[PDB]
């Protein structure tokens, strides 16, 4: 393939659409977790290629992250960027939480982003180059009240990427995070109450910034790390939550 | 409810749990003891201290290990002012190497005990609306540990744990805050490492930036700090404890 | 009507690579004492260019002002600003003068607190606006041979955070990024990097085992600078290869 | 003989109640400024005390040496230095001046790196000591209304953590602990927590819900300065209710 290979792990949801439209924008050729026909279709009229990639987008297993990146290898023969996301919130004070849920948890926030490391880290260092990027959560970055466990787990996650960012650096590949909260995305109106205006207005007075972020905009500071265009930072998180962290 | 201050050692089998016992006991604390040796025992009795074993639950490996920790000291003292605990092994190798079984094996050891040890104690001490936890977990939660990517990991979920159930308690007067050490005198670390081995320790001891390995007995020194009810303004701390390693 | 940048310096480092990123974003510049060469380049990328000469070192509240001033006299607007300072100053703490302190202070934390001084303002009034103040990635830990340069990095981060915070209801973004082991001519010297015997050390040392390029730098700084992104403020980002 | 620990002010804060803790701890003294009555109190307890008069500012290097030789002059040895100074300073980064910024500096951080420069070469000529710079918990996080101040406690803090790192193999440790919240007159006054319903919104602010007080800030100090732990370096911890 001519053209730089991107594999987004899910596009089913949150900022995997936008991350496709971008990197379309950035003449990347895509591999897709469960890409709907009409984005194949939309990014298809920017120019890109497209592989879509069904039923392993949850990253459950390392046979699903291999799956994705075995995908790039096999369609376009080359993987230049991978970015995934993973996990869903849990809240509820410390003292009424149960082991369960901690192990709920840490299966979606950090054996998800494992897997996904695991499969394409061993393909980039083999070519000596490529961006990877693990959105984890801005809980992950602070005492997140209400969600003890789930910023204890994120934290986790952040570390990990440092840890693989530092161990494969001498090979080129970048490996970093970024971790949102207050988006304006579904999942996350549905979880806070924000479907109701009267609330949503609440959600915004916590955040700094005094509104929610889009999937567009995190889309577009995504691309620092993925495009090509930056090679020079790995071991990086950047919290992307209005000030908030 | 008894006079003098109660402290539980979840684990007096190794590493700085008898130095722990012993600096509490230096401090007129009664003490609850996970596994003592009976020598310890007799030991801490001769300072004057009123000792209570608890046998088999010093893993933590469940809720119930760590409410039964938590219930002897309610039984045999109806207080419970201070508790400290450390759990997990290192596990070393490139990530690449590493299995997700492995990641799920270091996750039980170094989140899931301290998940069960607060479970049980926060909710004692936030009814006396009082009292001093310690969690130790390890220096290699705080940065990237060349050999133990998963390991560190895990580590910072512990210690990112710590923080959060310390800002929820906070308002109740219960202090939660966490230490982790790297390159200590103790045989767990010395078989892991390659230490016991002089060369391979001295070596090991050249790349510590203060050029040598810790002892338990000054590390037990340093813990007091959170522990002893001197200090009681901070709370969601991680200190390092690794000669300047992190 | 077109966004404006203030690139404070494109005399050196990242500066005239900013300026290029802006303009192939679609920005009209202001500068501080860029080239007529750099200014013809911008020019033919179809950008309009209002130079400010002599205020690039940001020494004085003045200095900082003027800057902000000719963006509101040409453009009536200021949409992005960005700008750097300060000289890399080496040895061992325990041979080190008060003097020098004083020294890297100005140049570390002055500079951005002028910057800050006379921008915040300017965007605070619009409701919009994108600051990003270049520190250094020796702010965020540790250096050895440079522990007072550290120190003072840190403060400048340490400020960006806390005018983030403070006007962050404003929609106005402030961010920070710092960088180390990078391709120009100042820090070559100042790590005796000029020699390859010491070139090689220094790559050693740095995780991704190479220096970093302007050009790579300038596209990474357009994350918090194009207007794309809006919804992160009071970060600091390393630019190190791993070193931080 | 008896470990000597110097405390650079006796005159407020956490100064008195640390100099009572070394004498708890068997030290001699050699202490800033203190009071006939808080040298016959520790000559009560066992502790030979030495005062240094009008240098308790650590306005520049010769009072910083001056500390550091009444030790040596004394007692021919140095174990333990602690010193805190700066003052609180308040108000809108957009209302603030330069000349703020620099007064800032000098407190927080000019007085600490005369303070270093001093004890550190005694020490690392001994292989041994215990150095504890007390900044604030305001240079750990951005401080609602103390921008200029958190930043350059910040830098402070860098500074602690870049001294530690070089020294590190000489056995001396140096560390950094930062109070916010505590009870002692100068905050009452600046906070107006002299009113008890102000005293009520200033503690609602600090996760623990009250103030610190010296007696407890002092034995937390002692981990880092009684010579019963010597093997970290280059921390800082927060003392302040959790708030950091």
Redesign the interface.
């Known amino acids: 393939s001519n053209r730089p290979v991107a594999l987004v792990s899910d596009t089913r949801y949150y900022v995997g659409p936008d991350l496709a439209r971008r990197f379309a924008e950035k003449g990347f050729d895509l591999v897709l977790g469960d890409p709907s026909p009409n984005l194949v279709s939309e990014l298809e009229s920017m120019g890109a290629r497209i592989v879509p990639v069904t039923g392993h987008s949850d990253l459950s297993s390392?046979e699903s992250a291999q799956a994705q990146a075995d995908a790039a290898l096999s369609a376009f023969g080359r993987l230049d960027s991978a970015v995934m996301f993973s996990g869903q919130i849990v809240t509820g004070?410390?003292?009424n939480?149960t082991?369960d849920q901690?192990?709920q948890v840490?299966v979606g926030c950090?054996?998800a982003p494992?897997?996904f490391?695991?499969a394409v880290?061993?393909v980039m260092?083999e070519r000596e180059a490529g961006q990877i990027l693990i959105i984890t959560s801005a809980s992950?970055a602070?005492?997140?009240?209400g969600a003890?466990?789930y910023?204890?787990?994120?934290?986790?996650?952040?570390?990990?990427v440092?840890?693989?960012?530092?161990?494969?650096?001498?090979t080129?590949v970048?490996v970093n995070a970024v971790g949102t909260n207050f988006?304006d995305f579904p999942a996350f109106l549905k979880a806070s109450g924000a479907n109701d205006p009267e609330v949503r207005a609440k959600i915004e007075s916590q955040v700094?910034?005094?509104?929610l972020?889009?999937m567009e905009?995190?889309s577009?500071?995504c691309?620092?790390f993925l495009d090509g265009?930056?090679?020079?930072?790995?071991?990086?998180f950047?919290?992307?939550?209005?000030?908030w962290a």
Request: glycine content about 8%; hydrophobic content about 40%.
């Open positions: 390392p004070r410390f003292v939480s082991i901690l192990r840490f950090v054996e494992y897997n490391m695991r880290v061993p260092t992950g602070r005492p997140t009240p003890p466990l910023s204890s787990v994120r934290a986790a996650a952040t570390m990990l440092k840890n693989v960012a530092d161990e494969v650096a001498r080129g970048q988006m700094p910034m005094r509104r972020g889009t905009e995190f577009a500071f691309m620092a265009s930056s090679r020079f930072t790995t071991g990086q950047v919290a992307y939550a209005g000030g």
